[PDB]
Design a protein around this ligand. Structure first.
Ligand SMILES: O=c1[nH]cnc2c1ncn2[C@@H]1O[C@H](COP(=O)(O)O)[C@@H](O)[C@H]1O
Ligand SMILES: O=c1[nH]cnc2c1ncn2[C@@H]1O[C@H](COP(=O)(O)O)[C@@H](O)[C@H]1O
Ligand SMILES: O=c1[nH]cnc2c1ncn2[C@@H]1O[C@H](COP(=O)(O)O)[C@@H](O)[C@H]1O
Ligand SMILES: O=c1[nH]cnc2c1ncn2[C@@H]1O[C@H](COP(=O)(O)O)[C@@H](O)[C@H]1O
Ligand SMILES: [Cl-]
Ligand SMILES: [Cl-]
Ligand SMILES: [Cl-]
Ligand SMILES: [Cl-]
Ligand SMILES: [K+]
Ligand SMILES: [K+]
Ligand SMILES: [K+]
Ligand SMILES: [K+]
Lengths: 357, 357, 357, 357
C-alpha cells in the first residue's frame, strides 16, 4: 500500500491565535539570524533570481536591514562585479539606521552558486561576499553534500547556505555536512511548476515546521523560501520556526529589481520568471514559467508594508521579539470557508490598499 | 513542533438541525441581553463605523428594539452631539412598539471609545450614554485592561463593553477586569484584512463558542461582531451562545447610514470602509479596505428580513426564545458540496429576493 | 460548548463502488414502493410545484411508471379538477406498457395539502386521489402531527405522505403518527434558500441515510426530495436507502410542466420558482427564489435519460433490483479533487450531451 | 446505515516527498512491464480511442518505447489493416534507439476488443498483434470473465489485458481468470461522465493503490488508465504502484492522432471524444462527451515532456529505476490551499510553457 506520511499544510491552512499583549507593534524587535554567524536586523531576503536581485536590489535590502542574494545566471566576472558594487556602496547612516553591515561597515551581501562551481566560489570570496548560497532544485543530493564539504574544506570560515529542502532527513544531512543555514522550499514558489511537472513537493508550512525541528538540534537557522503572498505569510513562517524569509514575486515589480518597466493596457508591469523557466535557461523540460508582475514602486515601500504586517502580528501575539514570537505562537487550522471569511468578502473594493492587492 | 490548538470553524462550515416544534416564527420571543444590566428587544447592533452608525442609524436601531453604537472617528463634542440627538429623539409609541428605551423613556444608545480616552468617557457619560464600547483591534491587551479598570473605578455603574477578542483566555481576562460584555471577532469583518496582513485570527463560529463558554462562568454576555453575511448567520451565532450580534456591511447601504447615495453603471451604492482603512485613518499599515455596498433601502426593511430569518430558524429548532434556542441547538458540520447544495444551484435567478442577494 | 452531532455529506461527497455484475442495465428491475400500500414501476416523482406539476405532467409521470403530485397553490375546486383530469385520462396500453395505475386501470395521482386543510382533503378524496402529500417547510411539528392523526381518523385507508424532515427523530415521530411514507429534504432544493435564510438544514445524503434507518423500523418508505442535479444523484439516493426520488428543476423545463416557453438571447427557457418564493406566495420573508431553467423538450426524454443513468448504476453494482441495489451498495467519500476528476475536465465540450449539461 | 468503505484520493490530493538522491534524471531507467510477458522501454500507452490511436500514433508510440492500442470502433478488416501497418512499419534504428519491438524486430502493437468478439480476436492474432486489450465500462463482470477464459483456452500464449476496474475484488477476479495485466480506471477520464451519469467510480490514486496491492499477489502489472493531466500525474501513478499509464487527452491533439486540424478563433484544435459519447456510438444514454483539444504538435514532443517530468520526479526521490521508485515513494496528503500553492500563483503567465498549460 502507498505510504502517506502526513497531511501537510501551507500558509492558507492556518492562522495565529491572539495572545495577551503588553507590547506595541512599533516597540517589538525584528532582528534575527541569517546563519549561525550572520545576523539580520530585518528577517527579509530577496530571491536569487535574474528578475529580482542584482546589486541595487541587494544594496537596498541590506540598507533596510535584510539581505540580497545576487543570482548566478551570469558569468563569474559579472557576479563578482555585482558583489563588489554592494560592498563598495557605503547622509545614509541615519537615512538607513538599521543597515546590515559587516565588521568593516560595508553592506552585507550574498551570492548564489551551483554544484561544483568552485571557481565561482573562489572569485566571490576574494570579492568579499559575506555568504554563499548553494542552491539546487534538490538540496538533498550527493552533488550538494559533496560541494558543501569541498567549500568548507577550502574556506572553513565562509558562511554557507544550502538548499532547497523540504524534509527533516534533508535538514539533518545538510546540517551534518556543516552548513550554516538551510533553505526550505520545494515547489511553493509563485513561478514554480515543480509540483505539477514532477509531482514532488511539500506544502510550505509543514515543510518549515519539519525542517526547523531537525535543524534546531544543530543550532542551524532555517530560511523559508517561496510561497509568500502577503505580509501575514511572513508572520506565519517565522512563528512556525523559520529564522528568515526569502521573497521573489513581491519584490520583482520594484524600481530596484533588474529589467525595465513596460506598459500593457494602461498599466505598468515588470518581468518575473522562474530560474528554471525556458527563458532563464536560455529540448529542455522547464520547472518554472515566464510571467509578469504589477509595478509597485520602491523596495522600501514594499518592505515597510511587509514589516508593518509582521510587527502587527507580533503585537497580536504579545511577542517582544522573534524568539519570543516562536515560543508564544499557537495556531488554528481553518477551512476554505474560514479563508474566505479572512479575506475581504461581500464588499466591492474601490480604493487600492498598500498591503492588500 | 508547531502548536495547532484546534480546527476552527466559521458560519459556512455548519448548519442547525431541525427539531420538534410547537411554536410559530411569529410567536417566538427574540429579546436578549446586551450587557449584564441592559436588555435588548432585538438581538441586533449596528457597528461603530463612520459609514454605518451615527445618530439617525442609532435612533432607528433603538426604535426597532436593538442598539446603535456611535463611532469614535470624530471629535468629542461631535460624538456628544450624536449621543444627545438619540437621547432627545423621543405616533412613535406603537409605530415602534418594541423600542429599546431607558428608565426615562429615552432611546438607548452606545458610543465607542479607545484606550486611554478618559476625557471622551467623561463627556459621553454626562451626555447620558447608556453603554460605552471600548473597542480595539486587540482587546486582550494591557492597554484595554487598564482602561477597563480606570473606567470602572470612576464610573462603577457605567455599562462597559470591551473587545475585540477571539479566545477563552481573553474572555477570562476581560471578565475578571469587570466588563459587562465582551465583543468577539478578530478578522471576520467584511472589510477586514487583519488575518491576511498579520496572519492572526480565529474563524468566527469557533471564536464565539470558545469565548461564550468562558464568559458564561461570569454571567457575561457575548457580542458576535463581524462576518455576518445572511440572516442565517445571525441564527447560527446566537444558537452557538452569543447574546447579540453586531453588523456592519448589511446596514451600510441603508438610508440612515452616514454618507450619500451615488450611481455607478446605472446602480446606486453607498461607501463602506474599514475603520482601519487608509481613508478612515486619514506610511500607515492598514488592516481594512475602502469599498462600496449596494443601496438596499431603509434600515427597517433590512432588519425585518434579518429578524424574519432568525424567527424562522427558532421555529425550525422549536425554540420559544433565545435561551431555549441555545439549549436546543444541535449542529452538523458540512462540506463545500453541502454549502453549494445549501445555496441556490442549477437555476438562473430572474427576480431579486429581499433576503438573498 | 456547541453540540456538533455529525459531519454530514451530500451527493457530491460520495461515489458508488463497482461490484461483480451478471446483469445488464436493460435487464434490471426498477419497480419500488411509493408508500406502504402503493407501488411504482419507476422510482421518480415530480415535485408539487406550480412550475412543475399539474394534470399533464402528472399524466406523463404516471404513464412512464412514476407519479406526479398536483401542487396546492390553487383553489380546492381547481385541484380537484386537475386530479380528475388525471384519473379520467385513460394505443396507450403498450405505447406506455409501464403505466402506474390503480385497481380500476386509472392512472395514479398525488395531491399536496397543508396543515389543517381538512376541507381540501375531503374534496381530493372524493375526487379519487390515490395519495395525499402533507408537506410543510417543517414536517417535524405539532401542526403536521395533528393533521396526520386527523386525516387517519377520518380516512383510515387513505395513503398519506408527510414531510419534509431531515432527522431520525422526525422520522420516528411521523411513523408513530401512522404515515405511509416520509419525505426527506430540508434545504437541498435548487430554488431553496432555507439553509441560508434560517441557517437550518442537513446535507441530503446524510439526511436520507439517517431517516431511512429509522423509517425502516416501521416498514415506511423514504422519499428523497430535492437536490437532484444528475441521474447519478438518483442512483446515490436510492442506493443509500430511499425508496423513491422527488424532482423539481430537472422537470421544470419540459413541455408538460405549467407555464409557457419564452426566448432569451436566442435561447428558450421556462420559469422555475420556489413555492416559498415571493411570486408563488403572491412584508414576507421568502425561503425560495424565482428563476429560469433551459427548455429540455419532453418529460419522456428527460425521464429516459434519468432512468438510463439509474440502470447503468445498478449494472455497475451488479444489482438485479432496487432492494438488491441497496444491499450491495458500498460508497467511498471523495475530495473536491475527486469531484473535479469525476466531471469532464481539461476538454472543451463542443456537442451537447443528453444527460450532461 | 450506508457503508462508506474509505475516503478515496486522486492525483491532486497527494504529492511525493523528496528523498536523498545520487542519480540524475538523465541517468535513471524508465523501462517497465506492460504485461507479465511484455516489457516497455517507456511506461506510456496511447488510449484505444478513435480520436487518439490508429496505425501512425501506434507506430510512434512503439518507436519511442511505449505502445499504442488500436481502437475497436471499426470493422474487423480495418483493425487488421491498422495492426498490419504497424507490424510492417520497420535510419530509424538510432533515430529511435528505444523502439519497442518483438522477437522479429517488428514494432509492438495492441488492439482493443469487446465482450464475445472472438471473430475479431482470431483475425487480430493471425495479423500478429502482440497484445489484446479486452476493455469494458465494467471489467468486473461475467461477460468479461467468460471472454478472458474463452480467449485463454483458444490462445494460451496470447497476452491479454482486461479492464476497466477500480477495486481489489475486481483485480482478484481478473487475475484468477488468468489475465496478463489489469487496466484500472472507472470514471477518471477527461471525457468521461460515468461518475456523474451513474454515480459510480473511484478516485484514481486510491483505485490504483487498491488494485496494485491485490494484483501484486499474482505478479500481474497494473495499467493506470485515465485522469492524467500533467507529467506529475504520471509520476504519482507509477510511484503508487502502477507499471504503466494509458493516456487519451494529452495525445489527442498531436499530428499522429486520427482526425484533421481545424481553426477556431485563430487557434488550431483537434477533435477528442469519449468512446461512450453519442458521436462515437453512432435513445442512447451516453457516458462520455464530444469535445476539442488544442493542437500541440508531434507525439514525440509531448512524450519528451511527459518523460522529462517522470525523470525529474525519480531524480527528486532518488530512484534508479521504476521498481526502486515504487519502493522509495513516500506521499503527503495536501489541501486545496496546498494545490493552489503547487500551481503557478499570483503571477500572470506571459510565455507558453511546453509542459504546463
Ligand atoms: O523556475 C524555478 N523553478 C522552481 N522554483 C524556482 C524557480 N525559480 C525560482 N524558484 C524558487 O522560488 C522562489 C521564489 O518564490 P516566490 O516568493 O513565491 O516568487 C525562489 O527564491 C526560488 O527558491
Ligand atoms: O478596518 C478594520 N479592520 C478590521 N476590522 C474592522 C475594521 N473596521 C471595522 N472592523 C470590524 O468589522 C466589523 C464589521 O463586520 P461586517 O458585519 O462583516 O462588515 C466591525 O463591527 C468591526 O468589529
Ligand atoms: O420555495 C421553497 N423553499 C424551500 N424548498 C422548496 C421551495 N419550493 C420547493 N421546495 C422543495 O424543493 C424541491 C425541489 O428540489 P429540486 O429538485 O432541487 O428543484 C421540492 O420538491 C420541495 O421539496
Ligand atoms: O466515453 C467514455 N466513457 C467513459 N470512459 C471513457 C470513454 N472513452 C474513453 N474512456 C476512458 O478514458 C480514458 C482516457 O482518459 P484521459 O487520459 O483522461 O483522456 C480512456 O483510455 C478510457 O479508459
Ligand atoms: Cl546604478
Ligand atoms: Cl436628521
Ligand atoms: Cl390538455
Ligand atoms: Cl500514413
Ligand atoms: K475579513
Ligand atoms: K438550496
Ligand atoms: K471524468
Ligand atoms: K508553485
Amino acid at each position: 500500500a502507498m505510504k502517506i506520511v502526513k497531511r501537510a499544510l501551507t500558509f492558507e491552512d492556518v492562522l495565529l491565535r491572539p495572545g495577551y499583549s503588553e507590547v506595541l507593534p512599533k516597540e517589538v524587535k525584528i532582528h534575527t539570524k541569517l546563519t549561525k554567524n550572520i545576523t539580520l536586523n530585518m528577517p527579509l531576503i530577496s530571491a536569487a533570481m535574474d528578475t529580482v536581485t542584482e546589486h541595487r536590489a541587494a544594496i537596498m535590502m541590506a540598507r533596510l536591514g535584510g539581505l540580497g542574494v545576487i543570482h548566478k545566471n551570469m558569468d563569474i566576472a559579472s557576479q563578482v562585479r555585482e558583489v563588489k558594487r554592494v560592498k563598495k556602496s557605503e547622509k545614509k547612516r541615519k537615512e538607513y539606521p538599521d543597515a546590515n553591515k559587516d565588521n568593516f561597515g560595508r553592506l552585507r551581501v550574498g551570492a548564489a552558486i551551483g554544484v561544483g562551481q568552485m571557481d565561482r566560489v573562489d572569485a566571490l570570496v576574494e570579492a568579499g561576499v559575506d555568504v554563499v548560497v548553494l542552491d539546487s532544485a534538490h538540496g538533498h543530493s550527493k552533488g550538494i553534500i559533496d560541494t558543501v564539504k569541498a567549500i568548507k574544506a577550502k574556506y572553513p570560515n565562509l558562511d554557507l547556505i544550502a538548499g532547497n529542502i523540504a524534509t527533516a532527513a534533508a535538514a539533518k544531512a545538510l546540517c551534518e555536512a556543516g552548513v550554516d543555514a538551510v533553505k526550505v522550499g520545494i515547489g511553493p514558489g509563485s513561478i514554480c511548476t515543480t509540483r505539477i511537472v514532477s509531482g514532488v513537493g511539500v506544502p510550505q508550512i509543514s515543510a518549515i515546521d519539519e525542517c526547523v525541528e531537525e535543524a534546531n538540534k544543530f543550532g542551524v537557522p532555517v530560511i523559508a523560501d517561496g510561497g509568500i503572498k502577503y505580509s501575514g505569510d511572513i508572520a506565519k513562517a517565522l512563528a512556525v520556526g523559520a529564522s528568515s524569509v526569502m521573497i521573489g514575486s513581491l519584490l520583482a515589480g520594484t524600481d530596484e529589481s533588474p529589467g525595465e518597466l513596460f506598459t500593457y493596457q494602461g498599466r505598468q508591469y515588470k518581468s518575473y520568471r522562474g530560474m528554471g523557466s525556458l527563458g532563464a535557461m536560455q529540448k529542455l523540460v522547464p520547472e518554472g514559467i515566464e510571467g509578469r508582475v504589477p509595478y509597485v514602486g520602491s523596495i522600501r515601500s514594499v518592505v515597510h508594508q511587509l514589516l508593518g504586517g509582521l510587527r502587527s502580528s507580533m503585537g497580536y501575539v504579545g511577542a517582544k521579539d522573534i524568539e519570543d514570537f516562536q515560543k508564544r505562537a499557537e495556531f488554528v487550522e481553518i477551512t476554505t470557508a474560514g479563508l474566505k471569511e479572512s479575506h475581504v468578502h461581500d464588499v466591492t473594493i474601490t480604493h487600492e490598499a498598500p498591503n492588500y492587492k
